[PDB]
What does this fold into?
Amino acid sequence: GAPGDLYVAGCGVWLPPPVTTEQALAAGHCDRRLASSTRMLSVAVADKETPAEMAALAAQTALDRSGVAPAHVDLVLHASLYFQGHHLWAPSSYVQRVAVGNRCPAMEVRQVSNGGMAALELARAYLLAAPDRVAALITTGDRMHPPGFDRWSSDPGTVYADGGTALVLSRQGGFARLRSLVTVSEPVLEGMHRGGHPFGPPSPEEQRAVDLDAHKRAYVAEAGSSFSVARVSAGQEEALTGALEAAGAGLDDISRVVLPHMGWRRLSAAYFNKWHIQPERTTWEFGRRTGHLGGGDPIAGFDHLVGSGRLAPGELCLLVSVGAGFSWSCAVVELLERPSWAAA
Amino acid sequence: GDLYVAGCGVWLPPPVTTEQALAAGHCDRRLASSTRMLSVAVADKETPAEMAALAAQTALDRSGVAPAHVDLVLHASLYFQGHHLWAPSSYVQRVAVGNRCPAMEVRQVSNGGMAALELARAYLLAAPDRVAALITTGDRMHPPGFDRWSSDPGTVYADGGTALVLSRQGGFARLRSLVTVSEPVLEGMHRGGHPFGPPSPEEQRAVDLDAHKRAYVAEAGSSFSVARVSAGQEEALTGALEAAGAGLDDISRVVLPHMGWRRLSAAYFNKWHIQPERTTWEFGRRTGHLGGGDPIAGFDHLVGSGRLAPGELCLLVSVGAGFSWSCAVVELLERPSWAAA
It folds into this structure.
């Protein structure tokens, strides 16, 4: 391809064993109404593995598949939205030690549920900023366990997964081409996911049981429901239309849509009933068995589409990601060839 | 073409003296004597993003850069930001910038500010029409999760925010070099679990870095650890100086991490043979370790107090657990208008 062309050279996940909704119901973690509203079938849940461990595991898979040498990994970025396990410790340096074994800069990037795409933006910029740079590694990892987090009710309508994802970005080549990547920011909405006055300073710290539902009602009270809904809608539309236009495509040109692993009710309101697309055109069935992987959903979703053979050479894929803040990223990815690790 | 520093700022809450810390039993006489800390900025109710936002307002106002020309917002920190599943960079963007460019967090422990500086540099250089980027740091190191005097004995941690405005267009200073070095073999020094195995299960208990360091040295060896730490530092220093076409003798001022006297003497004064008077020692010892914002606070101090003169080079020195090191050589082009004589 052209110069300035960026490629996906490898990707991978490490997902711990699934806990089914049935197991969750029987264990009092989930009530049947939330089971019915989200239509979740299972969620990946870790036993002992920590976030950086899962991220490093995913990275080893992504790197091997990529065939890219450690000496050509010029940047390591690790994204997450929850506690990485040890304070004043560098999880990106763990990832680098274990999965890459080189000496390039290794750091964390965070943008809540949009962290993976956020890291993708900075990785793209890093590779393009100097002519001699080759590849970048992006990972995500999160472990959403008690007592700090309740994966079913800390944020009702989305069920959170433990796990790690990874993607290798390259200026040199790969099996897919990054046709566009667009990020949109609407910071006016930041107060929706915190205590304190939505337009004043944040309340004192709250390590405790995360409880989004209560802060969101306080935000709407102040800002207005109409304003809140409209602004979320607009940001999503700007990212979608921005990514499609940058790629020379329309929604009809897109074969598969990678959506966030949220519950059915949320996906319908945001995507199925808005964009008038069918679930079978999306990663819905994969997501509903996996759960929300922190900021790593689009990497997991893309990896699944490619590994399963659902995406064919020449076809375009749309990555859709959103995070509190709010931030939205969309990307159009064109599959150039079926990688050797995929099934047909 | 080289980038510019267009503005910078800090927001530091009121000092708590070593005398008061002694009297409250937070600090003993050996620790006061070894660190030689005079005071540390301690926040009352201010949260990290809040302090970061205040420092950013100051830095942006000084820069004169319009919000439309701020193409990226990066917020760095090393400790809990106060609310899970919430976007502190978005708070900072809302409060201090009012614009719609991407806002995100970058972390690298105590090297976070310089790490954000690396990514912001790349971002500005990655497209021909980009102009400025905002980098902020903000942390609040309160009990019972953290003990500012004894979680990492030898360094005393401050609450505060810092901010720098980086531009391709112009500014009062030129970023002449910026170089980052990474030694991930040392990552295990700051966590539980086997230094060369997976991390131990999630902590809880207040930060106890000394327990992890002893466990690391006991496994990897003291000789190995000291030499590798020393080599990383040497690589960053030399890398930055060479990239600027300079030597340590050409540097007028050195911005050092705000560690205690004993650590600074071992790492820098008795290693490089530079005089403490040529550094931000006196500013740091009254301020404390500002998470990853020290080199921003220190450079801001040097400039605003008129200690740096047009034509003179300043060396920023930063290090964080990981380990990661960054050094940068900044040339002062003109004394800005907020700067005393």
Chain A has two domains: 1-175, 176-335. Residues 176-335 of chain A form a domain with the Peroxisomal Thiolase; Chain A, domain 1 fold (CATH 3.40.47.10). Chain A touches chain B through 72 residues (CB under 8 Å).
